Short mmCIF file of C-alpha atoms in Angstrom, two decimals:
data_model
loop_
_atom_site.label_atom_id
_atom_site.label_comp_id
_atom_site.label_asym_id
_atom_site.label_seq_id
_atom_site.Cartn_x
_atom_site.Cartn_y
_atom_site.Cartn_z
CA UNK A 1 24.34 -28.79 0.91
CA UNK A 2 20.48 -28.92 1.68
CA UNK A 3 18.26 -26.57 0.93
CA UNK A 4 15.15 -27.63 2.84
CA UNK A 5 17.65 -27.48 5.84
CA UNK A 6 18.06 -24.02 5.13
CA UNK A 7 14.42 -22.73 5.33
CA UNK A 8 14.26 -24.66 8.32
CA UNK A 9 17.17 -22.39 9.59
CA UNK A 10 15.31 -19.61 8.72
CA UNK A 11 12.38 -20.96 10.52
CA UNK A 12 13.95 -21.28 13.55
CA UNK A 13 15.66 -17.60 12.99
CA UNK A 14 12.81 -15.82 12.17
CA UNK A 15 10.13 -17.70 14.49
CA UNK A 16 8.11 -18.39 11.30
CA UNK A 17 6.66 -21.03 9.22
CA UNK A 18 7.47 -20.71 5.58
CA UNK A 19 6.31 -22.56 2.57
CA UNK A 20 7.76 -22.36 -0.71
CA UNK A 21 7.09 -23.69 -4.26
CA UNK A 22 9.06 -22.99 -7.11
CA UNK A 23 7.44 -25.24 -10.24
CA UNK A 24 10.40 -27.72 -11.82
CA UNK A 25 10.88 -26.51 -15.78
CA UNK A 26 12.49 -27.97 -18.62
CA UNK A 27 15.80 -26.81 -16.86
CA UNK A 28 15.20 -26.87 -12.81
CA UNK A 29 14.20 -28.66 -10.19
CA UNK A 30 11.36 -27.62 -8.52
CA UNK A 31 11.95 -25.94 -5.04
CA UNK A 32 9.14 -27.26 -2.31
CA UNK A 33 8.92 -26.85 1.45
CA UNK A 34 6.16 -27.03 3.07
CA UNK A 35 4.41 -26.74 0.00
CA UNK A 36 0.85 -28.53 0.72
CA UNK A 37 0.61 -26.99 3.97
CA UNK A 38 -2.52 -24.28 4.15
CA UNK A 39 -1.47 -20.90 4.44
CA UNK A 40 -3.91 -18.05 4.18
CA UNK A 41 -3.90 -16.35 1.17
CA UNK A 42 -4.39 -12.43 2.43
CA UNK A 43 -4.09 -10.23 -0.58
CA UNK A 44 -2.11 -12.35 -2.95
CA UNK A 45 -5.73 -13.87 -3.87
CA UNK A 46 -6.20 -10.53 -5.87
CA UNK A 47 -3.99 -11.70 -8.59
CA UNK A 48 -6.00 -14.68 -9.65
CA UNK A 49 -9.44 -12.92 -8.65
CA UNK A 50 -8.21 -10.12 -11.36
CA UNK A 51 -7.87 -13.02 -14.16
CA UNK A 52 -11.59 -14.48 -13.27
CA UNK A 53 -12.53 -10.79 -14.12
CA UNK A 54 -10.71 -10.53 -17.27
CA UNK A 55 -11.80 -14.65 -18.18
CA UNK A 56 -15.21 -14.16 -17.65
CA UNK A 57 -15.63 -10.64 -19.72
CA UNK A 58 -14.95 -9.17 -22.74
CA UNK A 59 -11.90 -6.32 -22.71
CA UNK A 60 -14.89 -3.81 -22.59
CA UNK A 61 -15.33 -4.85 -19.52
CA UNK A 62 -12.79 -2.79 -18.53
CA UNK A 63 -14.48 0.32 -19.50
CA UNK A 64 -17.52 -0.53 -17.12
CA UNK A 65 -18.11 2.58 -14.22
CA UNK A 66 -18.83 1.01 -10.63
CA UNK A 67 -20.35 3.10 -8.30
CA UNK A 68 -20.23 2.45 -4.80
CA UNK A 69 -20.23 5.00 -1.41
CA UNK A 70 -18.14 5.86 1.24
CA UNK A 71 -19.98 2.50 3.18
CA UNK A 72 -17.93 0.02 0.87
CA UNK A 73 -14.97 1.18 2.26
CA UNK A 74 -14.36 -2.16 5.01
CA UNK A 75 -10.79 -2.47 4.42
CA UNK A 76 -7.68 -0.90 3.37
CA UNK A 77 -7.99 0.73 0.78
CA UNK A 78 -5.87 3.33 -0.89
CA UNK A 79 -7.14 4.36 -4.06
CA UNK A 80 -10.88 3.31 -3.93
CA UNK A 81 -11.68 5.53 -0.34
CA UNK A 82 -10.63 8.65 -3.00
CA UNK A 83 -12.85 7.79 -5.81
CA UNK A 84 -15.96 7.32 -4.04
CA UNK A 85 -18.03 10.50 -5.78
CA UNK A 86 -16.41 9.25 -9.37
CA UNK A 87 -16.73 5.26 -9.20
CA UNK A 88 -14.01 3.26 -10.88
CA UNK A 89 -13.96 1.23 -13.84
CA UNK A 90 -13.63 -2.26 -13.39
CA UNK A 91 -9.82 -1.78 -14.97
CA UNK A 92 -8.93 1.18 -12.69
CA UNK A 93 -10.58 -1.65 -9.91
CA UNK A 94 -7.88 -4.75 -11.30
CA UNK A 95 -4.92 -1.49 -11.26
CA UNK A 96 -5.94 -0.77 -7.27
CA UNK A 97 -6.50 -4.64 -6.34
CA UNK A 98 -2.99 -5.42 -7.88
CA UNK A 99 -0.92 -2.75 -7.22
CA UNK A 100 -2.42 -1.43 -3.74
CA UNK A 101 -4.41 -4.27 -2.42
CA UNK A 102 -7.08 -2.31 -2.12
CA UNK A 103 -9.66 -4.54 -0.48
CA UNK A 104 -12.45 -2.27 -1.58
CA UNK A 105 -11.61 -2.68 -5.44
CA UNK A 106 -11.09 -6.85 -4.26
CA UNK A 107 -14.61 -6.45 -2.86
CA UNK A 108 -15.97 -5.35 -5.93
CA UNK A 109 -14.17 -7.36 -8.30
CA UNK A 110 -15.44 -10.33 -6.13
CA UNK A 111 -19.48 -9.00 -6.56
CA UNK A 112 -18.95 -8.63 -10.27
CA UNK A 113 -17.67 -12.00 -10.36
CA UNK A 114 -20.00 -13.93 -8.45
CA UNK A 115 -22.96 -10.84 -7.21
CA UNK A 116 -23.01 -9.60 -3.48
CA UNK A 117 -23.57 -13.39 -2.20
CA UNK A 118 -21.94 -15.50 -4.86
CA UNK A 119 -18.28 -13.60 -5.45
CA UNK A 120 -16.29 -15.53 -3.31
CA UNK A 121 -17.51 -19.29 -4.42
CA UNK A 122 -17.17 -17.41 -7.60
CA UNK A 123 -13.76 -16.82 -7.44
CA UNK A 124 -13.09 -20.53 -5.88
CA UNK A 125 -15.29 -22.03 -8.59
CA UNK A 126 -12.79 -20.11 -11.21
CA UNK A 127 -9.67 -21.84 -9.26
CA UNK A 128 -11.30 -24.90 -9.37
CA UNK A 129 -11.60 -24.31 -12.85
CA UNK A 130 -7.80 -24.13 -13.33
CA UNK A 131 -7.31 -27.63 -11.23
CA UNK A 132 -6.66 -26.35 -7.88
CA UNK A 133 -9.09 -28.96 -5.53
CA UNK A 134 -7.31 -27.19 -2.03
CA UNK A 135 -7.84 -23.30 -1.95
CA UNK A 136 -11.19 -21.92 -1.00
CA UNK A 137 -12.24 -17.83 -0.57
CA UNK A 138 -14.96 -17.60 1.86
CA UNK A 139 -14.69 -14.28 3.28
CA UNK A 140 -14.52 -10.91 1.46
CA UNK A 141 -11.99 -7.92 2.75
CA UNK A 142 -11.07 -7.83 5.62
CA UNK A 143 -11.61 -10.41 7.45
CA UNK A 144 -10.18 -13.14 5.00
CA UNK A 145 -7.10 -12.10 6.44
CA UNK A 146 -8.27 -12.78 10.10
CA UNK A 147 -8.71 -16.27 10.61
CA UNK A 148 -6.96 -18.06 13.24
CA UNK A 149 -4.18 -20.85 12.22
CA UNK A 150 -5.73 -24.33 11.36
CA UNK A 151 -9.24 -22.96 10.03
CA UNK A 152 -9.37 -23.50 6.56
CA UNK A 153 -11.18 -20.93 5.29
CA UNK A 154 -9.42 -18.22 2.96
CA UNK A 155 -6.57 -20.90 2.46
CA UNK A 156 -4.08 -22.22 -0.25
CA UNK A 157 -0.88 -24.22 -0.11
CA UNK A 158 2.42 -22.69 -1.88
CA UNK A 159 2.02 -25.64 -4.75
CA UNK A 160 -1.48 -24.84 -5.58
CA UNK A 161 -1.14 -21.18 -5.76
CA UNK A 162 1.97 -21.78 -7.62
CA UNK A 163 0.47 -23.49 -10.02
CA UNK A 164 -1.87 -21.73 -10.41
CA UNK A 165 0.14 -18.04 -11.16
CA UNK A 166 2.10 -20.51 -13.31
CA UNK A 167 -1.03 -20.89 -15.79
CA UNK A 168 -2.00 -17.35 -15.40
CA UNK A 169 1.00 -15.53 -16.44
CA UNK A 170 3.08 -18.69 -18.27
CA UNK A 171 0.48 -21.02 -19.45
CA UNK A 172 -2.44 -20.48 -21.17
CA UNK A 173 -5.25 -19.98 -18.54
CA UNK A 174 -6.12 -16.76 -19.89
CA UNK A 175 -5.64 -15.39 -23.81
CA UNK A 176 -2.39 -13.61 -24.20
CA UNK A 177 -4.11 -10.37 -24.49
CA UNK A 178 -5.64 -10.91 -20.96
CA UNK A 179 -2.35 -12.39 -19.61
CA UNK A 180 -0.85 -9.30 -20.51
CA UNK A 181 -2.91 -7.08 -18.76
CA UNK A 182 -2.32 -9.20 -15.48
CA UNK A 183 1.26 -9.30 -15.96
CA UNK A 184 1.18 -5.21 -16.83
CA UNK A 185 -0.54 -4.79 -13.72
CA UNK A 186 1.41 -7.31 -11.47
CA UNK A 187 4.70 -5.48 -13.24
CA UNK A 188 3.68 -2.23 -11.91
CA UNK A 189 3.43 -3.32 -8.40
CA UNK A 190 6.15 -1.68 -5.53
CA UNK A 191 4.21 -3.31 -2.86
CA UNK A 192 6.76 -6.25 -2.89
CA UNK A 193 9.63 -4.29 -3.06
CA UNK A 194 10.93 -5.83 -0.24
CA UNK A 195 9.96 -9.63 -0.31
CA UNK A 196 10.79 -11.57 -3.44
CA UNK A 197 12.14 -8.81 -5.61
CA UNK A 198 14.71 -7.72 -2.30
CA UNK A 199 16.27 -11.73 -2.86
CA UNK A 200 16.88 -11.57 -6.60
CA UNK A 201 19.81 -9.59 -8.54
CA UNK A 202 18.48 -6.14 -9.96
CA UNK A 203 19.39 -7.88 -13.60
CA UNK A 204 16.21 -10.39 -12.84
CA UNK A 205 12.83 -8.72 -13.83
CA UNK A 206 10.27 -9.83 -10.89
CA UNK A 207 6.55 -9.16 -11.27
CA UNK A 208 4.31 -10.06 -7.66
CA UNK A 209 1.47 -9.71 -5.60
CA UNK A 210 2.04 -9.55 -1.65
CA UNK A 211 -0.46 -10.37 0.84
CA UNK A 212 -0.11 -9.32 4.79
CA UNK A 213 -2.79 -10.42 7.50
CA UNK A 214 -2.78 -11.21 10.92
CA UNK A 215 -0.81 -14.02 12.63
CA UNK A 216 2.52 -12.69 11.26
CA UNK A 217 1.08 -13.64 7.88
CA UNK A 218 3.26 -12.11 5.29
CA UNK A 219 2.94 -13.65 1.34
CA UNK A 220 4.75 -12.67 -2.44
CA UNK A 221 3.81 -14.89 -5.41
CA UNK A 222 6.00 -13.89 -8.23
CA UNK A 223 7.01 -14.64 -11.61
CA UNK A 224 10.64 -13.56 -11.76
CA UNK A 225 12.31 -13.59 -15.60
CA UNK A 226 16.46 -14.48 -15.57
CA UNK A 227 18.69 -12.03 -17.24
CA UNK A 228 18.96 -14.62 -19.91
CA UNK A 229 14.97 -14.37 -20.35
CA UNK A 230 14.40 -17.49 -18.66
CA UNK A 231 11.13 -17.53 -16.03
CA UNK A 232 9.97 -18.97 -13.22
CA UNK A 233 7.21 -18.73 -10.71
CA UNK A 234 8.15 -18.03 -6.81
CA UNK A 235 5.46 -18.55 -4.20
CA UNK A 236 6.50 -18.03 -0.57
CA UNK A 237 4.49 -17.85 2.35
CA UNK A 238 5.04 -16.98 6.13
CA UNK A 239 3.09 -16.89 8.84
CA UNK A 240 4.25 -16.40 12.91
CA UNK A 241 1.08 -17.76 14.37
CA UNK A 242 3.05 -18.79 17.82
CA UNK A 243 2.94 -15.02 18.51
CA UNK A 244 -0.65 -14.49 18.20
CA UNK A 245 -3.14 -12.59 15.69
CA UNK A 246 -1.35 -9.60 16.30
CA UNK A 247 2.12 -11.04 15.59
CA UNK A 248 4.28 -8.82 13.32
CA UNK A 249 4.73 -10.01 9.88
CA UNK A 250 8.47 -9.89 8.53
CA UNK A 251 9.04 -8.89 5.22
CA UNK A 252 12.41 -9.97 5.45
CA UNK A 253 12.13 -13.28 5.74
CA UNK A 254 10.24 -13.58 2.24
CA UNK A 255 13.72 -11.71 0.89
CA UNK A 256 15.94 -14.14 2.36
CA UNK A 257 13.57 -16.90 1.20
CA UNK A 258 13.69 -15.42 -2.53
CA UNK A 259 17.40 -14.94 -2.11
CA UNK A 260 17.84 -18.85 -1.18
CA UNK A 261 15.79 -20.19 -4.22
CA UNK A 262 17.89 -17.16 -6.59
CA UNK A 263 20.93 -18.91 -5.37
CA UNK A 264 19.96 -22.29 -6.83
CA UNK A 265 17.99 -20.92 -9.74
CA UNK A 266 21.21 -18.32 -10.83
#
């Protein structure tokens, strides 16, 4: 049979472009479909963003209180928009950026990393530090969701983001204490319940970070553990740019791609 042909079928059926990368392991072949094509990050960048902040600071930084105003809410911010009077610690911002894709939390973390004018360049440099010479972040929330198809700004590839996530969660990019915090935030994220999680049987552990944006963009990046505890990284990216900037993103496409990945990893 041919898994690439089945991913092409999914593209036809959803009127979408699909990108998949599951890195090879000691027990398994890579899965790669449009893996070197660019896709917008959308909120998937918030996982490596939290990694960057963890990397750059001692863990005491998690307790630093960040203050902001209602004028700083410029994107979908389910947590931050309720704490304008209290502020939020860095740890709380990390939590909100991963579990609620909070755009203001992500913009505040970008500013923590790079200063007000340098956060996106700082983030890009963190990915350069992991060996990623393709990905680039250029805008903050919400504009990073909104670039036209073909614009390289605010893009990654399934191959690049999968190998970043592999290094962050399974590899040694972060010390194991910091790694555990990133893994726990991703593990307590329910935003992706209808994406990669929906394509893996309930006895597999799935931690993930979703992304959603214009031109029908729906992404999910996950680490999964088999019932016997074998880990894999699964990156699924999609867009529906043929439908225009207001094309509906389709979570189900990512669930079905994930089902096809789970069928070959099971």
